[PDB]
Amino acid sequence: APCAADVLPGTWRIDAKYSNGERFEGRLEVRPETPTKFRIRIEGKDSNGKPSHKEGWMEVRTCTKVEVRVKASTGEESRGYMELKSPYKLRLEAKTYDRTGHPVYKVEGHLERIA
Questions:
Q1: CA-CA distance, 34 to 3, in Å (whole number)?
Q2: What is the domain range of residue 6?
């Protein structure tokens, strides 16, 4: 089966839910940097329409798993993994930390590739 690295570049739709009951919907754009590393940008909205933006990187861990680390301008950092479930679908699990490194919520999401 194809590895995550082979199918990652392009644009993905993201739908995520947080452990604090908030939600996120938007798009993730993945650009290749090196064979094992990708730059990512995330843009979307919460359930009241409020926009949010994150940027960061993804690094290959296994044929099906990539590590993701992103930051917001608030100073919040998120770190987790995405697992390839099909040629066009990833499952996300991550933890978000505030500026001082205290955990604020956990994130679970599904991504599907649209370009």
A1: 15
A2: 1-115
Q: What are phi and psi of 13, to 5 degrees?
A: -85, 135
Element (H, E) at 43: strand 37-45
Count of domains observed in the chain = 1
Query: 37, 45, 94, 48: which is closest to 71 by C-alpha?
Result: 94
Resolution in A: 1.7
Tokens describing residue 105: 């919520």
CA atoms within 13 A on the CB side of 103: 10
Half-sphere exposure of 106 (CA within 13 A, CB side): 4
Number of neighbouring beta carbons within 10 Å of residue 14: 18
Q: How was this structure determined?
A: X-ray
Which residues make beta-bridge pairs with 86? 89
